[PDB]
Amino acid sequence: SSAQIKLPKLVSDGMVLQRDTPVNLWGWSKPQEVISIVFAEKNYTTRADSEGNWKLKLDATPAGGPYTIALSASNTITLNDVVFGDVWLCSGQSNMELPMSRVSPLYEDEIASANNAEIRYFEVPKTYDFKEEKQDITFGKWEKVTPETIENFSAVAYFFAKNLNAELQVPIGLINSSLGGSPAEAWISEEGLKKFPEYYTEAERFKDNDLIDSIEQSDQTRRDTWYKTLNDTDQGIINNWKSADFDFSGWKIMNIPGYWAATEIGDKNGSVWFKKQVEIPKKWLNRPIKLLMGRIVDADSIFVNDTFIGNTTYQYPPRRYEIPAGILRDGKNTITVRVLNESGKGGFVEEKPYKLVMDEQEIDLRGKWHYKLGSEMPFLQGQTFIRWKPEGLYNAMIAPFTSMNLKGVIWYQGESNADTPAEYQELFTTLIEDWRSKWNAPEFPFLFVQLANFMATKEEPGDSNWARLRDAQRRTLAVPHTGMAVTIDIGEGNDIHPLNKKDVGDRLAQAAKHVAHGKNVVAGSPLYDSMEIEGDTIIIRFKNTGSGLMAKNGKPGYFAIAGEDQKFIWADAVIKDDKILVSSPAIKNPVAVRYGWADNPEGANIYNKEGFPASPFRTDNW
Ligand SMILES: [Ca+2]
Ligand SMILES: [Ca+2]
Ligand SMILES: [Ca+2]
Ligand SMILES: [Ca+2]
């Protein structure tokens, strides 16, 4: 702006500023306006440039507060409740976004009690811009941890801050700038994208609003028409199958969990209805009951008797619905589920809870359900996600903050690049260098999360695009002032959004203690350093062994070894100190070792004694 003093949304009441450094305050005014600032009983002045931009440095201030900052020129603004602490930018895709509410079943006591005015959070609006690097955002405010705010905070960011605040005893500010499903190249500026012509040219393409409008309108009409035709052809809607009294005794049966592709319906999309009678004891009546219905591909509405109780519109959230008192009746009760499936295999994910819960008591809902096809629809092609295109997230969600002094970044991203791992080390290195060039800071620690275990286990040695993504992450640790949290032990085979985010936060906090704070503590997880061939044995040396390596719950697992024919076989591995000796009787001249090299390497059990799991790795470049 240029009519009067205006501050960025980030520079606002309740904010955290970075401690112990000359610290930037910035905003807009009239051109050449002289701005008077009073902070900690000292006067500052600065003059705006000819475009009405102004900036200065307040004196280095130690942790604590509160402080006011009074700003005056043609108008006046007071910032209240400002504190000094460590300010962290928190970014990535879905696993950085995932809120405390989504992981609540692991952390109910934490959520109920959360109250810490020194942990403060700033949610950045999730949007893009292809035409320019933005200087502000549309809205946002700093919030403190309270029982009323905690549920919507990023779980990883919250546990990271909880750890650091507990140890360092200073305020922690968290700026959450994340976007589900986003690939790394969405988060890189035009300058960084010059190294990636394919992505540079794509960003340029999307400067055309008419292109955007035509894509979005086409996608919207396809989706709307699909849902409308579905509803108009669904025999369950036409014939009121949601009714508790509908006689479904003639329907066929399938087990839940499971997918209807295994029934005579086969691999059809559209809608399928499910019914079950449940026996409810008298002592469960007139009380609130919880219904867990696992995870469903893609969407569901659930009815209990004649009452709609809830719906979920996409495949990723767990189904956790409440059944208020008064809906269940003595004995004879029906649950009805209408499942909508746009694409892929519709149904109920395995290894998830399907039950009613009251107190510590449960009624298991796994087993036989009656089912019938509602409407067979052709698969619905997914939208073009314009918000995943190169550059747009840098421009609208990172560029606004490049004047903010930070302690560092935490980053959890890569699932959306796991299909193209060969470029990822270079792409992610480019991102880190790109941001550092915008902040221009004496140091800028960049801490990131290696992808978790996911998908099915595998009995024999094999290659894996997820393992290749994880390895690209591990190799990025060559970049200065970086650290990594390993998560191969705390993911879930059947869920890309695992609930254990406290261990993620704690592992990032360990990295921060070492990298950002220069503490004399183990840096995190054991990392492959070097190999030596000696006869039938390869000796692996590790960094970050702390007080020693160990194998949990058995001998060293998930090591494989290969000779020059590149055929890996499960190897024996023995720990000697900070080294692991890997060998197979079946291979006389080994040239390569792999550890935990799978989508889901259950059995990879190497830790340091400080509790941090070794990174998976490979010695080869095949
Ligand atoms: Ca104020
Ligand atoms: Ca340009
Ligand atoms: Ca991709
Ligand atoms: Ca390093």
Author numbering: 19 to 640
Give the article text.
We determined the full-length structures of two members (Fl8CE20_II and PpCE20_II) from the carbohydrate esterase family 20 (CE20) by X-ray crystallography that feature an ancillary domain, inserted into the catalytic SGNH-hydrolase domain. Detailed structural analysis identifies a so far undescribed catalytic triad architecture which lacks the typical aspartate for polarization of the histidine but instead reveals a precisely coordinated water molecule mediating contact between the His and Asp. This coordinated water in the Ser-His-(H2O-Asp/Asn) motif, as further confirmed by mutational studies and by determination of kinetic constants, is crucial for catalytic activity. We therefore term this active site architecture a water-mediated catalytic triad.
Fl8CE20_II was previously proven to solely act as a de-O-acetylase on acetylated xylans. The ancillary domain of Fl8CE20_II has a β-sandwich fold, composed by eight antiparallel β-strands, reminiscent from β-galactosidases of the GH2 family (PFAM PF02837 or PF13364). In both crystal structures of Fl8CE20_II and PpCE20_II, representing the only structures of CE20 enzymes featuring the inserted ancillary domain solved so far, the Asp (Fl8CE20_II: Asp513; PpCE20_II: Asp518) carboxylate has a distance to the catalytic His Nδ of 4.0 Å which is too far away for a direct interaction. Instead, the Asp side chain contributes to precisely coordinating a water molecule (Fl8CE20_II: 2.9 Å), which is in direct hydrogen bond distance to the catalytic His base (Fl8CE20_II: 2.9 Å). The tetrahedral coordination geometry of this water molecule is completed by interaction with a main chain carbonyl oxygen of Tyr334 in the ancillary domain and by another water molecule. Moreover, besides coordinating the water molecule, Asp513 in the SGNH hydrolase domain forms a direct salt bridge to Lys370 of the ancillary domain. Thus, Asp513 has a dual function, i.e., a catalytic role in coordinating and positioning the catalytic water molecule and a structural role in binding and orienting the ancillary domain with direct consequences on substrate binding. As expected, the mutation Asp513 to Ala in Fl8CE20_II (D513A) resulted in complete inactivation of the enzyme showing the importance of this residue for catalysis. In conclusion, we could clearly show that the active site Asp/Asn side chain of Fl8CE20_II is in fact, crucial for catalytic activity, while it is, in contrast to a conventional triad, not directly interacting with the His.
